[PDB]
Ligand code: NA
Protein backbone atom coordinates (compact mmCIF):
# COMPACT_ATOMS: atom_id res chain seq x y z
CA UNK A 1 0.00 0.00 0.00
CA UNK A 2 1.34 3.41 -1.10
CA UNK A 3 0.07 6.40 0.81
CA UNK A 4 1.41 9.85 1.48
CA UNK A 5 0.86 9.76 5.25
CA UNK A 6 0.90 13.60 5.41
CA UNK A 7 0.22 16.54 5.53
CA UNK A 8 0.19 17.21 9.23
CA UNK A 9 -1.69 20.37 10.29
CA UNK A 10 -1.61 21.78 13.82
CA UNK A 11 -3.95 24.69 14.61
CA UNK A 12 -3.37 26.49 17.92
CA UNK A 13 -5.96 28.91 19.29
CA UNK A 14 -5.80 30.97 22.46
CA UNK A 15 -8.63 29.88 24.86
CA UNK A 16 -10.26 33.29 24.55
CA UNK A 17 -10.61 33.13 20.77
CA UNK A 18 -14.19 33.09 19.46
CA UNK A 19 -14.84 31.20 16.23
CA UNK A 20 -17.81 31.21 13.82
CA UNK A 21 -17.60 27.39 13.64
CA UNK A 22 -17.14 24.47 15.98
CA UNK A 23 -13.50 23.24 16.12
CA UNK A 24 -14.69 20.11 14.22
CA UNK A 25 -16.12 22.32 11.48
CA UNK A 26 -12.92 24.30 11.32
CA UNK A 27 -10.89 21.11 10.97
CA UNK A 28 -13.32 19.90 8.26
CA UNK A 29 -12.98 23.17 6.39
CA UNK A 30 -9.17 23.27 6.65
CA UNK A 31 -8.98 19.66 5.43
CA UNK A 32 -11.41 20.42 2.52
CA UNK A 33 -9.20 23.39 1.56
CA UNK A 34 -6.09 21.22 1.59
CA UNK A 35 -7.86 18.43 -0.36
CA UNK A 36 -9.08 20.98 -2.94
CA UNK A 37 -5.45 21.78 -3.80
CA UNK A 38 -5.22 18.44 -5.68
CA UNK A 39 -1.90 17.69 -3.95
CA UNK A 40 -3.02 15.25 -1.24
CA UNK A 41 -4.82 12.00 -0.67
CA UNK A 42 -8.11 12.44 1.12
CA UNK A 43 -7.23 10.14 4.04
CA UNK A 44 -3.66 11.46 4.35
CA UNK A 45 -4.52 14.95 5.66
CA UNK A 46 -4.13 14.73 9.45
CA UNK A 47 -5.21 17.79 11.44
CA UNK A 48 -5.54 18.79 15.08
CA UNK A 49 -6.85 21.83 16.94
CA UNK A 50 -5.17 22.69 20.21
CA UNK A 51 -6.61 25.14 22.72
CA UNK A 52 -3.94 27.18 24.50
CA UNK A 53 -4.86 27.69 28.15
CA UNK A 54 -1.64 29.56 29.16
CA UNK A 55 -0.70 32.27 26.62
CA UNK A 56 0.70 35.74 26.52
CA UNK A 57 0.98 38.13 23.60
CA UNK A 58 3.50 40.93 23.90
CA UNK A 59 3.98 42.83 27.16
CA UNK A 60 0.99 45.30 27.21
CA UNK A 61 -1.94 44.85 29.57
CA UNK A 62 -4.36 44.49 26.64
CA UNK A 63 -6.67 41.40 26.24
CA UNK A 64 -5.63 39.69 23.01
CA UNK A 65 -6.37 36.50 21.12
CA UNK A 66 -4.45 34.74 18.35
CA UNK A 67 -4.72 31.80 16.00
CA UNK A 68 -1.75 30.02 14.40
CA UNK A 69 -1.38 26.99 12.17
CA UNK A 70 1.61 24.98 11.12
CA UNK A 71 1.25 22.92 7.99
CA UNK A 72 3.95 20.25 7.56
CA UNK A 73 4.41 18.75 4.14
CA UNK A 74 7.15 16.60 2.57
CA UNK A 75 10.17 18.43 1.24
CA UNK A 76 10.62 18.92 -2.48
CA UNK A 77 7.84 21.29 -3.58
CA UNK A 78 8.60 24.69 -5.02
CA UNK A 79 8.21 28.03 -3.28
CA UNK A 80 4.98 28.95 -5.11
CA UNK A 81 3.38 25.67 -4.01
CA UNK A 82 4.21 26.17 -0.35
CA UNK A 83 3.04 29.81 -0.45
CA UNK A 84 -0.29 28.86 -2.09
CA UNK A 85 -0.99 26.20 0.49
CA UNK A 86 -0.32 28.59 3.37
CA UNK A 87 -2.54 31.28 1.84
CA UNK A 88 -5.42 28.85 1.31
CA UNK A 89 -5.26 27.87 5.00
CA UNK A 90 -4.94 31.47 6.17
CA UNK A 91 -8.16 32.33 4.27
CA UNK A 92 -10.01 29.45 6.01
CA UNK A 93 -8.66 30.33 9.46
CA UNK A 94 -9.12 34.09 9.19
CA UNK A 95 -12.68 33.53 7.91
CA UNK A 96 -13.55 31.45 10.97
CA UNK A 97 -12.57 34.14 13.49
CA UNK A 98 -15.56 35.80 15.26
CA UNK A 99 -13.34 37.81 17.62
CA UNK A 100 -11.42 37.65 20.88
CA UNK A 101 -9.70 39.96 23.30
CA UNK A 102 -10.21 43.72 22.95
CA UNK A 103 -8.50 44.32 19.61
CA UNK A 104 -7.87 42.59 16.28
CA UNK A 105 -6.87 38.94 16.14
CA UNK A 106 -3.60 37.93 14.52
CA UNK A 107 -3.90 34.85 12.33
CA UNK A 108 -0.78 33.15 10.99
CA UNK A 109 0.13 30.10 8.98
CA UNK A 110 3.63 28.54 8.70
CA UNK A 111 4.33 26.04 5.96
CA UNK A 112 7.24 23.79 6.81
CA UNK A 113 8.94 20.79 5.20
CA UNK A 114 9.66 17.34 6.57
CA UNK A 115 12.59 15.32 5.26
CA UNK A 116 10.98 12.70 3.12
CA UNK A 117 14.14 10.50 3.07
CA UNK A 118 13.79 9.91 6.81
CA UNK A 119 9.98 10.08 7.12
CA UNK A 120 8.74 6.69 8.32
CA UNK A 121 5.13 5.60 7.89
CA UNK A 122 2.96 2.57 8.32
CA UNK A 123 -0.63 1.56 8.44
CA UNK A 124 -1.59 -0.78 11.31
CA UNK A 125 -4.53 -2.79 9.95
CA UNK A 126 -7.79 -2.85 11.85
CA UNK B 127 29.16 18.70 32.81
CA UNK B 128 29.14 18.00 29.08
CA UNK B 129 25.74 16.83 27.94
CA UNK B 130 23.80 16.60 24.70
CA UNK B 131 20.56 18.13 26.07
CA UNK B 132 18.62 16.29 23.30
CA UNK B 133 16.99 14.52 21.55
CA UNK B 134 13.41 15.76 22.00
CA UNK B 135 10.65 13.34 21.08
CA UNK B 136 6.97 14.33 20.87
CA UNK B 137 4.33 11.61 20.35
CA UNK B 138 0.79 12.71 19.43
CA UNK B 139 -2.14 10.25 19.47
CA UNK B 140 -5.72 11.02 18.51
CA UNK B 141 -8.07 10.64 21.56
CA UNK B 142 -9.88 7.64 19.94
CA UNK B 143 -6.68 5.63 19.62
CA UNK B 144 -6.37 2.51 21.77
CA UNK B 145 -2.82 1.39 22.63
CA UNK B 146 -1.44 -1.86 24.00
CA UNK B 147 0.59 0.06 26.54
CA UNK B 148 0.16 3.08 28.77
CA UNK B 149 1.56 6.37 27.36
CA UNK B 150 4.32 6.10 29.94
CA UNK B 151 5.23 2.57 28.77
CA UNK B 152 5.22 3.69 25.16
CA UNK B 153 7.64 6.56 26.13
CA UNK B 154 9.84 4.05 27.96
CA UNK B 155 9.97 1.79 24.89
CA UNK B 156 10.72 4.77 22.61
CA UNK B 157 13.52 6.01 24.88
CA UNK B 158 14.95 2.46 25.10
CA UNK B 159 14.94 2.25 21.28
CA UNK B 160 16.64 5.64 21.02
CA UNK B 161 19.27 4.75 23.67
CA UNK B 162 19.89 1.38 21.92
CA UNK B 163 20.99 3.38 18.80
CA UNK B 164 24.21 4.34 20.62
CA UNK B 165 23.82 7.95 19.42
CA UNK B 166 22.54 9.55 22.67
CA UNK B 167 23.40 10.02 26.30
CA UNK B 168 20.99 8.19 28.60
CA UNK B 169 19.72 11.28 30.51
CA UNK B 170 19.56 13.46 27.40
CA UNK B 171 16.62 11.68 25.72
CA UNK B 172 13.53 13.75 26.59
CA UNK B 173 10.15 12.46 25.46
CA UNK B 174 6.51 13.43 25.95
CA UNK B 175 3.15 12.07 24.85
CA UNK B 176 0.07 14.17 24.12
CA UNK B 177 -3.51 13.12 23.37
CA UNK B 178 -5.17 15.18 20.63
CA UNK B 179 -8.68 15.98 21.84
CA UNK B 180 -9.76 17.71 18.64
CA UNK B 181 -8.64 16.07 15.39
CA UNK B 182 -9.74 15.19 11.91
CA UNK B 183 -8.21 12.95 9.26
CA UNK B 184 -9.39 13.90 5.81
CA UNK B 185 -12.92 14.95 4.96
CA UNK B 186 -14.85 11.66 4.61
CA UNK B 187 -17.44 10.70 7.24
CA UNK B 188 -15.26 7.81 8.47
CA UNK B 189 -13.98 7.33 12.02
CA UNK B 190 -10.20 7.38 11.93
CA UNK B 191 -7.33 7.41 14.41
CA UNK B 192 -3.71 8.29 13.88
CA UNK B 193 -0.39 8.29 15.76
CA UNK B 194 2.58 10.60 15.00
CA UNK B 195 6.01 11.29 16.42
CA UNK B 196 8.46 14.10 15.78
CA UNK B 197 12.05 13.35 16.80
CA UNK B 198 14.26 16.44 16.98
CA UNK B 199 18.01 15.98 16.91
CA UNK B 200 20.96 18.35 16.46
CA UNK B 201 21.88 19.14 12.89
CA UNK B 202 24.94 17.64 11.23
CA UNK B 203 24.14 13.92 11.00
CA UNK B 204 23.87 12.18 7.63
CA UNK B 205 20.77 10.98 5.86
CA UNK B 206 21.28 7.30 6.82
CA UNK B 207 21.43 8.18 10.53
CA UNK B 208 18.21 10.19 10.40
CA UNK B 209 16.39 7.49 8.39
CA UNK B 210 17.46 4.73 10.77
CA UNK B 211 16.28 6.64 13.84
CA UNK B 212 12.88 7.28 12.27
CA UNK B 213 12.46 3.61 11.28
CA UNK B 214 13.35 2.43 14.78
CA UNK B 215 10.73 4.68 16.35
CA UNK B 216 8.11 3.81 13.75
CA UNK B 217 8.47 0.12 14.67
CA UNK B 218 7.96 0.93 18.36
CA UNK B 219 4.91 3.15 17.70
CA UNK B 220 3.28 0.71 15.24
CA UNK B 221 3.82 -2.13 17.78
CA UNK B 222 1.93 -0.16 20.44
CA UNK B 223 -1.27 0.33 18.43
CA UNK B 224 -4.28 -1.73 19.51
CA UNK B 225 -6.78 0.03 17.19
CA UNK B 226 -8.94 3.11 16.69
CA UNK B 227 -11.75 4.34 14.47
CA UNK B 228 -13.31 2.09 11.86
CA UNK B 229 -10.27 1.44 9.69
CA UNK B 230 -6.43 1.06 9.81
CA UNK B 231 -4.33 3.45 11.91
CA UNK B 232 -1.73 5.59 10.14
CA UNK B 233 1.55 5.78 12.13
CA UNK B 234 4.23 8.29 11.12
CA UNK B 235 7.56 9.58 12.39
CA UNK B 236 9.36 12.76 11.26
CA UNK B 237 13.03 13.18 12.12
CA UNK B 238 13.92 16.91 12.12
CA UNK B 239 17.07 18.90 12.87
CA UNK B 240 17.73 21.73 15.35
CA UNK B 241 20.48 24.30 14.69
CA UNK B 242 23.18 23.32 17.12
CA UNK B 243 24.98 26.71 16.85
CA UNK B 244 21.97 28.45 18.45
CA UNK B 245 20.75 25.64 20.72
CA UNK B 246 21.00 26.81 24.34
CA UNK B 247 21.21 24.34 27.24
CA UNK B 248 21.91 24.29 30.96
CA UNK B 249 21.54 22.00 33.93
CA UNK B 250 20.06 23.78 36.97
CA UNK B 251 21.64 21.90 39.86
CA UNK B 252 19.77 20.12 42.57
CA UNK C 253 -0.80 47.92 7.58
CA UNK C 254 2.37 46.13 8.50
CA UNK C 255 3.13 43.71 11.24
CA UNK C 256 5.60 40.90 11.82
CA UNK C 257 3.11 38.32 13.09
CA UNK C 258 5.85 36.42 14.97
CA UNK C 259 7.87 35.29 16.92
CA UNK C 260 6.05 32.22 18.23
CA UNK C 261 7.38 30.79 21.51
CA UNK C 262 6.32 27.43 22.98
CA UNK C 263 7.49 26.51 26.50
CA UNK C 264 7.06 22.92 27.69
CA UNK C 265 7.56 21.88 31.35
CA UNK C 266 7.29 18.45 32.90
CA UNK C 267 4.41 18.31 35.44
CA UNK C 268 6.94 17.58 38.25
CA UNK C 269 8.97 20.76 37.57
CA UNK C 270 8.66 23.43 40.26
CA UNK C 271 8.94 27.03 39.03
CA UNK C 272 9.77 30.15 41.08
CA UNK C 273 6.65 31.77 39.59
CA UNK C 274 3.54 30.75 37.72
CA UNK C 275 3.48 29.72 34.06
CA UNK C 276 1.72 33.06 33.23
CA UNK C 277 4.49 35.02 34.94
CA UNK C 278 7.15 32.97 33.18
CA UNK C 279 5.51 33.76 29.83
CA UNK C 280 5.54 37.47 30.80
CA UNK C 281 9.27 37.28 31.61
CA UNK C 282 9.99 35.49 28.32
CA UNK C 283 8.01 38.04 26.29
CA UNK C 284 9.79 40.92 28.10
CA UNK C 285 13.19 39.39 27.30
CA UNK C 286 12.23 38.95 23.64
CA UNK C 287 10.88 42.50 23.42
CA UNK C 288 14.12 43.82 25.05
CA UNK C 289 16.06 42.43 22.09
CA UNK C 290 14.78 45.28 19.91
CA UNK C 291 14.04 42.76 17.10
CA UNK C 292 10.25 42.43 17.43
CA UNK C 293 7.02 44.41 17.56
CA UNK C 294 5.38 44.30 21.02
CA UNK C 295 2.08 42.81 19.85
CA UNK C 296 3.80 40.26 17.54
CA UNK C 297 5.43 38.16 20.29
CA UNK C 298 3.04 35.21 20.78
CA UNK C 299 3.87 32.75 23.55
CA UNK C 300 2.28 29.71 25.15
CA UNK C 301 3.11 27.29 27.97
CA UNK C 302 2.27 23.59 28.05
CA UNK C 303 2.58 21.33 31.17
CA UNK C 304 3.53 17.82 30.10
CA UNK C 305 1.61 15.19 32.00
CA UNK C 306 3.10 12.14 30.23
CA UNK C 307 6.91 12.40 29.96
CA UNK C 308 10.05 10.28 30.27
CA UNK C 309 13.70 11.28 30.36
CA UNK C 310 16.18 8.57 29.54
CA UNK C 311 15.77 4.98 30.66
CA UNK C 312 17.03 5.04 34.28
CA UNK C 313 14.58 4.65 37.17
CA UNK C 314 15.48 8.13 38.53
CA UNK C 315 12.89 10.98 38.87
CA UNK C 316 13.79 13.81 36.57
CA UNK C 317 12.20 17.05 35.38
CA UNK C 318 12.93 19.15 32.32
CA UNK C 319 12.03 22.49 30.71
CA UNK C 320 12.26 23.26 26.97
CA UNK C 321 11.36 26.15 24.73
CA UNK C 322 11.15 26.48 20.98
CA UNK C 323 11.39 30.00 19.54
CA UNK C 324 10.25 30.26 15.92
CA UNK C 325 11.32 33.36 13.95
CA UNK C 326 11.32 34.19 10.27
CA UNK C 327 14.28 32.96 8.22
CA UNK C 328 17.00 35.47 7.30
CA UNK C 329 18.81 36.43 10.50
CA UNK C 330 22.46 35.69 11.09
CA UNK C 331 23.90 32.97 13.27
CA UNK C 332 24.87 35.44 16.05
CA UNK C 333 21.31 36.78 16.27
CA UNK C 334 19.69 33.35 16.58
CA UNK C 335 22.22 32.30 19.18
CA UNK C 336 21.74 35.49 21.25
CA UNK C 337 17.92 35.11 21.21
CA UNK C 338 18.25 31.48 22.42
CA UNK C 339 20.65 32.44 25.19
CA UNK C 340 18.41 35.25 26.45
CA UNK C 341 15.51 32.81 26.75
CA UNK C 342 17.65 30.13 28.30
CA UNK C 343 18.65 32.59 31.06
CA UNK C 344 14.97 33.38 31.82
CA UNK C 345 13.98 29.70 31.84
CA UNK C 346 16.93 28.60 33.94
CA UNK C 347 16.27 31.39 36.46
CA UNK C 348 12.63 30.22 36.82
CA UNK C 349 13.51 26.64 37.94
CA UNK C 350 13.03 26.03 41.62
CA UNK C 351 13.53 22.27 41.35
CA UNK C 352 12.07 18.98 40.21
CA UNK C 353 12.88 15.30 40.30
CA UNK C 354 15.79 13.87 42.26
CA UNK C 355 18.66 15.51 40.33
CA UNK C 356 19.50 18.60 38.21
CA UNK C 357 17.00 19.98 35.70
CA UNK C 358 17.88 20.19 32.03
CA UNK C 359 16.76 23.43 30.43
CA UNK C 360 16.97 23.90 26.70
CA UNK C 361 16.02 26.34 23.99
CA UNK C 362 15.80 25.72 20.24
CA UNK C 363 15.70 28.67 17.89
CA UNK C 364 14.15 27.65 14.57
CA UNK C 365 13.35 29.44 11.33
CA UNK C 366 10.06 29.70 9.41
CA UNK C 367 10.07 30.27 5.69
CA UNK C 368 9.10 33.86 5.25
CA UNK C 369 8.08 33.48 1.58
CA UNK C 370 5.28 31.10 2.54
CA UNK C 371 4.32 32.56 5.94
CA UNK C 372 0.78 33.87 5.66
CA UNK C 373 -0.62 36.42 8.09
CA UNK C 374 -3.65 38.59 8.70
CA UNK C 375 -5.27 40.70 11.36
CA UNK C 376 -9.00 40.09 11.69
CA UNK C 377 -10.20 43.49 12.88
CA UNK C 378 -12.28 44.13 16.01
NA1 NA D 1 4.73 15.27 17.15
Ligand code: NA
Nearest residue numbers: 012262300302
Ligand atom coordinates in the same frame (compact mmCIF):
# COMPACT_ATOMS: atom_id res chain seq x y z
NA1 NA E 1 1.82 24.27 21.53
